[PDB]
Amino acid sequence: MWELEKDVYVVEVDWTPDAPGETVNLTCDTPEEDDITWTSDQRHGVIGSGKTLTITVKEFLDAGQYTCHKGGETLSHSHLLLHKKENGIWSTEILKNFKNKTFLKCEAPNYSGRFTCSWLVQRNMDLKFNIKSSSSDSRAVTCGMASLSAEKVTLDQRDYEKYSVSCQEDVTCPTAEETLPIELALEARQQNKYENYSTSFFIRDIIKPDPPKNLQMKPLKSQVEVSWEYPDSWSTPHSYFSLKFFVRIQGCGAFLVEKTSTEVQCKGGNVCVQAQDRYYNSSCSKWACVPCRVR
Amino acid sequence: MWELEKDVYVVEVDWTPDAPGETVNLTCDTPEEDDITWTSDQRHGVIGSGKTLTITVKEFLDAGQYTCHKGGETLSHSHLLLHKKENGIWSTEILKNFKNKTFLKCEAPNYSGRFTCSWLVQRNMDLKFNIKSSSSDSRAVTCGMASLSAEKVTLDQRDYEKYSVSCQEDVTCPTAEETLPIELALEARQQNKYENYSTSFFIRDIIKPDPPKNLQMKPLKSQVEVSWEYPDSWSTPHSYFSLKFFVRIQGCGAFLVEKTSTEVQCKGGNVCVQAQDRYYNSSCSKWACVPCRVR
Ligand SMILES: *[C@@H]1O[C@H](CO)[C@@H](O[C@@H]2O[C@H](CO)[C@@H](O[C@@H]3O[C@H](CO[C@H]4O[C@H](CO)[C@@H](O)[C@H](O[C@H]5O[C@H](CO)[C@@H](O)[C@H](O)[C@@H]5O)[C@@H]4O)[C@@H](O)[C@H](O[C@H]4O[C@H](CO)[C@@H](O)[C@H](O)[C@@H]4O)[C@@H]3O)[C@H](O)[C@H]2NC(C)=O)[C@H](O)[C@H]1NC(C)=O
Ligand SMILES: *[C@@H]1O[C@H](CO)[C@@H](O[C@@H]2O[C@H](CO)[C@@H](O[C@@H]3O[C@H](CO[C@H]4O[C@H](CO)[C@@H](O)[C@H](O[C@H]5O[C@H](CO)[C@@H](O)[C@H](O)[C@@H]5O)[C@@H]4O)[C@@H](O)[C@H](O[C@H]4O[C@H](CO)[C@@H](O)[C@H](O)[C@@H]4O)[C@@H]3O)[C@H](O)[C@H]2NC(C)=O)[C@H](O)[C@H]1NC(C)=O
Ligand SMILES: [Cl-]
Ligand SMILES: [Cl-]
């Protein structure tokens, strides 16, 4: 057993059918040594005595908050969390991996050093999350607090609630090549179940620019000119942070164009265009569409 | 002759004792072709006629503003500047080089990409300055407007007025090694004299941190502890952007200490400390001093 925060301990337990639980000792933060009794918020009545309580922890009813008591007064408390281990493998039950069997998916709309990471939960109940830089050589990152998103991700015939966190690399270098990845670790808590997850990535690999903006269209000799602009969130200056665009007619039959304008032949329909980093093949934006109509 | 801005041209002239001036043609921005006369703000009365004025420019009285005139109305103007060339060498007369025979000295208190460049003038009269990135591969820089500083630099038995400009690298990388220098060009104008100057530097080489702050002192078994803190302007985090300090008793007999505190034996006097980048030998701060007295 090890301490996670003050008066909160993680007990690693093996859930193979009949495996012996862990014997843990809880000592009461008190000077007294006589008439000390213990209680648990998972059980009813005195379940132990003495200043040091020894118990066998194997199932979740053994976890929770253990409280001290002497002469009718409560003296101290301690909280136990279980980190499950089955078939020799840490449990991955709080989060549901994405389609590619990964648990944390992160995204950046530019090279600012800002990015958002997301994960899916199997049950949105009594959750506590904490994400931070795994190592601090390392690219230090500052992360906000996780938030529940209105967007439910559908997998199988599943609708999962999604949590996302936005972070910022403390000191950034948008231009130079990244030679060390950003390393993060997520701690997940559900009631008294403890899990943790990790990921490592380069910003250049998780790039996903916003869609082109102000997609206008003008008529010419039919032939039609479609033009757009770089999204406002994209890194500046555009001369260095240059993008490419795919234009089609209705990760990432649409043809490539490098300028912010291109000729085409629509005459009735919606014309859509996406963007991508010009010199690196990261992810492409969502489609920006506008009706194809002129006078 | 070449155009600097609209209706302002630079004429390169040789000032070797008796060298032939340059023949320049000034054409009047008018449809008319008859009864066109010319005047100069350096001379009195009509000094030319015709829609195209041909003149020999060798001295500064030949420069200035030439004005068109027809039937009593002024039609157009053109302004001439001279870029002096003597003994086969461009003139360096508006600015006075620093002690090391350079003209532009720049300084940065951190790796933010912000820095200030300064130069000295021989005569603070009718001056116009403009500084910009020489090439725009290149580290683009945005510069404010030059300003006269109260600090007069004394050289020889000289007291020179100093001009300084503050600029910012548009996109910075404080951590990675600089492999290309920042290249700037200063244009200097004094009345109708034109000159320009250039410099190239790495930020790491022009680093000059601010002095240590809150230099406190406490007594111990005599022996005295002096402690300080990193300046607020220094790059963060200090764990990466680490400094060293020299401590002495009263570019950069004072001994080195790496922590922000050190023991010493003063008992009466001022104790001074300076700072320097820990892993690179740039310039050292100005001394931060405080009286050495305790109770
Ligand atoms: C993701 O999840 C994994 C799995 O849960 C995490 O791995 C665990 O991390 C913790 C914290 O880093 C590790 O804890 C440490 O364990 C060492 C070694 O302990 C041993 O030797 C001691 C010798 O005296 C002995 O007393 C210890 O006994 C206790 O534990 C055993 C079971 O391990 C139990 O049977 C006994 O009854 C005791 O209860 C033990 O045998 C320990 O030395 C560490 O503690 C010192 O240092 C820390 C940090 O300075 C300090 O806080 C302590 O107070 C103490 O001073 C610490 O407890 C644990 O071993 C990891 N588990 C595994 C399997 O490796 C992982 O960290 C998570 N990652 C992220 C990013 O969240
Ligand atoms: C620092 O200071 C130095 C010295 O002053 C600067 O160097 C000068 O920079 C300017 C601007 O870049 C240079 O000007 C250019 O000159 C070329 C070549 O001109 C020649 O060939 C022409 C062929 O038709 C000919 O007509 C020209 O004739 C004129 O000039 C000669 C004297 O040179 C004169 O005798 C004639 O009577 C004419 O008046 C000339 O022989 C020219 O082609 C350039 O112009 C075109 O392109 C520019 C930019 O697109 C455009 O603005 C023009 O309208 C034109 O379309 C331009 O005029 C000059 O040559 C440099 N001097 C030297 C010695 O190299 C330097 O730039 C400064 N640096 C900084 C950072 O400030
Ligand atoms: Cl990822
Ligand atoms: Cl310099």
Author numbering:
A (entry chain A), B (entry chain A): 23 to 158, 161 to 245, 247 to 275, 287 to 288, 292 to 334
How is this structure described in the published paper?
Here, we present the use of the GlycoDelete (GD) HEK cell line for protein crystallization, which produces homogeneous mature-like trisaccharide glycan stubs. The GD cell line is derived from the HEK293S MGAT1−/− cell line and has been transformed with Golgi-resident EndoT (an endo-β-N-acetyl­glucosaminidase similar to EndoH). This enzyme processes the Man5GlcNAc2 glycans, allowing the NG to be further processed by native Golgi-resident enzymes to generate mature-like glycans consisting of one GlcNac (which can be fucosylated), one galactose (Gal) and one sialic acid (Neu5Ac). The glycan stubs do not need further enzymatic processing, and we show that for heavily glycosylated fragments of human colony-stimulating factor 1 receptor (CSF-1R), murine IL-12B and human Down syndrome cell-adhesion molecule (DSCAM) the NG modifications facilitate the production of diffraction-quality crystals.
IL-12B is a soluble cytokine receptor-like protein associated with the heterodimeric pro-inflammatory cytokines interleukin-12 (IL-12) and interleukin-23 (IL-23). IL-12B is secreted as a monomer (denoted IL-12p40) and as a homodimer (denoted IL-12p80). IL12B can also form a disulfide-linked interaction mediated by Cys197 on murine IL-12p40 to form heterodimeric cytokines with the IL-12p35 subunit, resulting in IL-12, or the IL-23p19 subunit, resulting in IL-23. The crystallographic twofold axis present in the I41 lattice is located at Cys197, thereby forming a crystallographic homodimer. Aside from the homotypical disulfide, the interface area is very limited in size (287 Å2) and lacks specific interactions (13 interface residues per protomer and no hydrogen bonds or salt bridges). The electron density allows the modeling of a Man4GlcNAc2 glycan. The immature glycan is located between the D1 and D2 domains and may be difficult to access by the EndoT enzyme. Although the GD cell line was engineered to alter the glycosylation machinery, it does not affect the formation and retention of the immature glycan. We conclude that it is a critical feature of the GD cell line that the glycosylation is only reduced after it passes into the Golgi, as it retains the capability to secrete glycoproteins that require immature glycans for folding. The immature glycan was clearly present in the crystal structure of IL-12B based on recombinant protein produced by GD cells, illustrating the general versatility of this cell line for structural biology applications.
